[PDB]
Amino acid sequence: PKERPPLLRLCCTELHKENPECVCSTLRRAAKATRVRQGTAAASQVQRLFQTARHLPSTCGFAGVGTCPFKATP
Amino acid sequence: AGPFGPRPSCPSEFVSAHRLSACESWIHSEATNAG
Ligand SMILES: [Cl-]
Ligand SMILES: [Cl-]
Ligand SMILES: [Cl-]
Ligand code: NA
Ligand code: NA
Ligand code: NA
Numbered sequence A: 001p002k003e004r005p006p007l008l009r010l011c012c013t014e015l016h017k018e019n020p021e022c023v024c025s026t027l028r029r030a031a032k033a034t035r036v037r038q039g040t041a042a043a044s045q046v047q048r049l050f051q052t053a054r055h056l057p058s059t060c061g062f063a064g065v066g067t068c069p070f071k072a073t074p
Numbered sequence B: 001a002g003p004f005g006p007r008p009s010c011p012s013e014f015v016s017a018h019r020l021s022a023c024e025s026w027i028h029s030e031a032t033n034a035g
Helices: A006-015 A020-037 A043-059 B010-016 B018-031
Strands: none
Touching: A006 A043, A006 B018, A020 A043, A020 B010, A020 B018, A043 B018, B010 B018
């Protein structure tokens, strides 16, 4: 299908509730929350977790933002 | 910048956006696909 997965579309709707200059900070907070709640510790999983979050503005048509910059993972 | 500008409050926007709960589920789903 050319439409995106429904869960990704719901995520994009939620992101659109924020200002562009808040998106990367809130996605970092979301990534830390998932990492901690789900106890994700395998190195490749942790890296992919934070990378996925940083790319969501570009997965979600936030043209002004682009990809969020890398920040060292806690 | 002024006292009556838009003045975004990112933590308030985060909670108003359900803490991006759908993005959290998506991020989790992608993370466990690693390797
Ligand atoms: Cl979108
Ligand atoms: Cl925040
Ligand atoms: Cl989750
Ligand atoms: Na939180
Ligand atoms: Na490891
Ligand atoms: Na995918």
